[PDB]
Design a protein around this nucleic acid. Sequence first.
DNA 1: CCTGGAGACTAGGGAGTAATCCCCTTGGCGGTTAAAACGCGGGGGACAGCGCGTACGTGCGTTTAAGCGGTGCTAGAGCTGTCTACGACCA
DNA 2: TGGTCGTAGACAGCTCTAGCACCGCTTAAACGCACGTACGCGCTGTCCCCCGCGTTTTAACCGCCAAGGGGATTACTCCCTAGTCTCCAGG
Lengths: 164, 151, 172, 168
Amino acid sequence: GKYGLFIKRISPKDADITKESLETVNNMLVFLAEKLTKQANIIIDQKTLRHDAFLWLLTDIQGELGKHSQDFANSVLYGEKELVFPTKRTENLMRKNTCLRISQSAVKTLTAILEYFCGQIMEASFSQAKKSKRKRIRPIDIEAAISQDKELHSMFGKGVISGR
Amino acid sequence: LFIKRISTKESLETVNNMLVFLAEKLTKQANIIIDQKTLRHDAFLWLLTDIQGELGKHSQDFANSVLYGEKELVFPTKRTENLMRKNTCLRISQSAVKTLTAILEYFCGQIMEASFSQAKKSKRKRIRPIDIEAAISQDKELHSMFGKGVI
Amino acid sequence: HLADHVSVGETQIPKASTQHLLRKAGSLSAAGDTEVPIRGFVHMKLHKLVQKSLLAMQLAKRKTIMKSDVKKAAELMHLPVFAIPTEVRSQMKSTCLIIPKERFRTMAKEISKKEGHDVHIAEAALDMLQVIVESCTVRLLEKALVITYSGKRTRVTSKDIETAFMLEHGPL
Amino acid sequence: HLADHVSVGETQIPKASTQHLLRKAGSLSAAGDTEVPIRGFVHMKLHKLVQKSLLAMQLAKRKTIMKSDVKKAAELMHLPVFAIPTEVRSQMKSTCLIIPKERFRTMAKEISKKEGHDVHIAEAALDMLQVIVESCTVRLLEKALVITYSGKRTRVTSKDIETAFMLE
DNA sequence: CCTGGAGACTAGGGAGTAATCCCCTTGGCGGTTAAAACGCGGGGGACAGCGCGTACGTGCGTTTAAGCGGTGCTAGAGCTGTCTACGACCA
DNA sequence: TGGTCGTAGACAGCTCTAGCACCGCTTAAACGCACGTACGCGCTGTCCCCCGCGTTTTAACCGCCAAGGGGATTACTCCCTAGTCTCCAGG
């Protein structure tokens, strides 16, 4: 689950990031994946998982951001876009949290949504840093940024971060 | 379904539902807390050794007595097996099922006597949901344990 | 805030029902505007629950919800429930439920229509819905009553329940 | 009430920690008695966490708490930990640990001895305990602060803090 | 030069599909009643306003204990080969 | 009740490393004491908006009642996926 290389690859906003922050966001994404897959397990009524199930599970998320996410999912599935995170590691962590059957389409959708949330978190961090000028994205750039956005905190919040 | 034998269809449904919920939650906790590939009765035994008050001490003492002795054990082992196997992809043993049956029947006895006391305080010789609501609200430790639920 | 949640053009809970709910909370008196915040709160909770239930219904390639869908949504809120379909002081013993049944059915039908789904609803799903919603609203109202007593005051105001909502949840 | 929870004999959290915590939570200045309830709260929270930690300990028959142990303890309580082992503006930027460190190792040793298990402890577990306890206490103080504003009062009080804790 | 991963198949078991009959909902009609809504002193809780001392914000000295290593150490956390012993799956 | 069958978690032995305990030093914060005052407390004297009461529409609800529709059931097909395989090209 060490996705740090892909984080830098998908982050074109330079501003050399603290080594701690890569681990923090790695924990952030893996926790998101775990909660959302336990979600998928508890919502399904059939033995085999389906991509449309994940689509709907993200659809109820408040705001047009969910429709943007599913648009990106369609784009990566068939439209125009590709992925950068490995499929195999995601499949392993998938199997680690279920005793059911999963197809590749769900894997593609999950990778897409990970792309999307990683993009929003990195851009929000960079925007907060620009508000505070300087460079070299710091831990402080996460807190009061996730807290800055209403919807992110309203759906993530809770989680303890370094200090406060 | 055998709570009536232990001792109002609706109240039997409520007690069965709350018992199975408690069993499910405890099984989930035990599954997530352990790090070794299989679990033993000692895990649930320690899970008993966190309930403040002498009541937890009686709970663990009765579990130990059932393991060493026999007590009553009128509960279907197959039903318990189904209940945790439905929500566990791990390894188990018969000591664990015996312990969980003992603890669940002990809780059933406590809630039954609490309901009886609450009904007698209200001068009623029958079992009704309002009485069990008053009983579960009245006791501090049961309210702490069961506050999450609603009925 | 909470008042903005309600809008003109939809059905509303009867005011007397609100008053009975506040009395059931044990409050001896209330301000004249308390109906609006609780109307908004119950509408919001029902909206969230019905949306989640609709998602569950859609997942099963179904066309009408059952008790299974509602219980799955209930387990989804991390909120356990033990239900199966199968003057003021002298009132808490009453188990009779407050909100009229057909009003709540009309609310459900409207909120489903706004989602573009003319989906039938079974009475067991109803029972579960109003029991869970009354549970949440009574818990919130009790917390509000406590915070009002803490304020060294004897009544309740809209700002009080606004504060109570602010404490329990996070922002907005 | 948390007043009964605090006893005599164990180590004492210095008051300056209390005023610093209130400043971090955004309050103006502390009252003459607020130290006792907050100290009781932190003591009881650390008690619960270390007790669950020993619950984890007894499973593997080991005798040193590792980061795995503390993370299991944190998650079983449903707390998403994100830390890794690896005048309000005057401290808003600062995010260092606001409490002395040796005090809590002393507390951990004493509570473990009280339970009856003299057990060695690693620093990573200490850091995790630090972050979880600071988060919980700052949350509780913020709740109390918004309550005491809600009472049309510009000050904190022991009544306010205890009713805030009860409101949970 | 490794290694995990790019194809290959391949069968089964669940996934997808069609029919059906009736139970369970759904809409409607009617009676009326319990309830929901509209006035009314009032008076009692709320609030504007006045007054204070005292609990407390801020400032000053001082210690003593907390932090930064410094070091010897050991104990005890991992790592690595048995085996018997306790479930699982069968009669 | 017994057969066996298996695999796996205690068990013992090694090892090396990381907490641990003490040392010591140093210096920076905790605390206790003074001072002067801001405000929560406390009180007071008027206020106006719920709160019981009362009277007066209405539509929730229940009961029936027809009806229909899609849902749990059964039967049928099929293709998708894990799941083993395999050897081999990219890393």
